[PDB]
Design a protein around this ligand. Structure first.
Ligand SMILES: Nc1ncnc2c1ncn2[C@@H]1O[C@H](COP(=O)(O)OP(=O)(O)O)[C@@H](O)[C@H]1O
Ligand SMILES: [Mg+2]
Ligand SMILES: [Mg+2]
Length: 271
């Protein structure tokens, strides 16, 4: 802290993206000319939805984490109607957007994102911090195209129970999570498998037309591989998507998986 910011301190720019209770804008600090992102939240909306506490966890957890593959939060401020989170600006956008553009990624790009992701999560887990909402819309890209995990509104310390109502898609969530059961860091490992599959295939493994059917797919762990997915990718993905949390690999096992080391351009680091 030691810098109480206010809106007049920034020149607001173009909309970077859309959030649940406000948008994110590009912005520049008037004095230093530092470019960053401003996440805007409408108080009325936060309170009405009763998620004021997730915003609080997001600020406290993210402002304290320091890792190259984790989006920094510099601070916050608010006015009559709004809260503003000052974030590290991510120039290359979201992985969600990169996936819509390319339809699907090659093994090198996929393996490299998985490595950056695993590294980031390795650092979170060493503090028993579970992200629990790892989705491509929350995976951002730095100036070098490196992956950055953002949106810690669902993060919590492990072990944990689920007190909050789910809202969006169930696609990236493991069984223990969609069932409200107790859970831990292994939740993020399941999500990693879902991402690996979607990066390579172009759509998540349990995708279905309805919430009710997606829920069935996830519970029964019902997924199949298109012919083009290689043996190595199938192996890693099948290891990650295990119904029993304890059967899922440790991040180190993921980082040293032969298929990952063979295709990843960047080095692992859970060291
Ligand atoms: N630091 C950032 N740099 C660039 N774009 C961002 C940044 N933060 C968020 N966005 C964009 O805003 C969208 C929503 O932001 P997010 O922080 O996930 O809000 P919410 O908690 O409502 O989901 C993202 O999916 C992305 O498109
Ligand atoms: Mg988000
Ligand atoms: Mg959020």
């Amino acid at each position: 802290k030691k810098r109480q910011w206010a809106l007049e301190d920034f020149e607001i720019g173009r909309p970077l993206g859309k959030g649940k209770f406000g948008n994110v804008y590009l912005a520049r600090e008037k004095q230093s000319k530092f470019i960053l992102a401003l996440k805007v939240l409408f108080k009325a909306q936060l309170e009405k939805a009763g998620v004021e506490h997730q915003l609080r966890r997001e600020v406290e957890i993210q402002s304290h984490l320091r890792h190259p593959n984790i989006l920094r939060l510099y601070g916050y401020f608010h006015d009559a109607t709004r809260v503003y989170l000052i974030l590290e600006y991510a120039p290359l956008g979201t992985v969600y957007r990169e996936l819509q553009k390319l339809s699907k990624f090659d093994e090198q790009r996929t393996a490299t994102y998985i490595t950056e992701l695993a590294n980031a999560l390795s650092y979170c887990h060493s503090k028993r911090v579970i992200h629990r909402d790892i989705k491509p819309e929350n995976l951002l890209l730095g100036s070098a195209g490196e992956l950055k995990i953002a949106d810690f509104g669902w993060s919590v310390h492990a072990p944990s129970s689920r007190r909050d109502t789910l809202c969006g898609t169930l696609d990236y969530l493991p069984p223990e999570m969609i069932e409200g059961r107790m859970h831990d860091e292994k939740v993020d490992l399941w999500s990693l498998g879902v991402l690996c599959y979607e990066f390579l295939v172009g759509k998540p493994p349990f995708e279905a037309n309805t919430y009710q059917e997606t829920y069935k797919r996830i519970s029964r762990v019902e997924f199949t591989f298109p012919d083009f997915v290689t043996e190595g990718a199938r192996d890693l993905i099948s290891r990650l998507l295990k119904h029993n949390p304890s059967q899922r690999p440790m991040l180190r096992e993921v980082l040293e998986h032969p298929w990952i080391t063979a295709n990843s351009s960047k080095p692992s680091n859970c060291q």
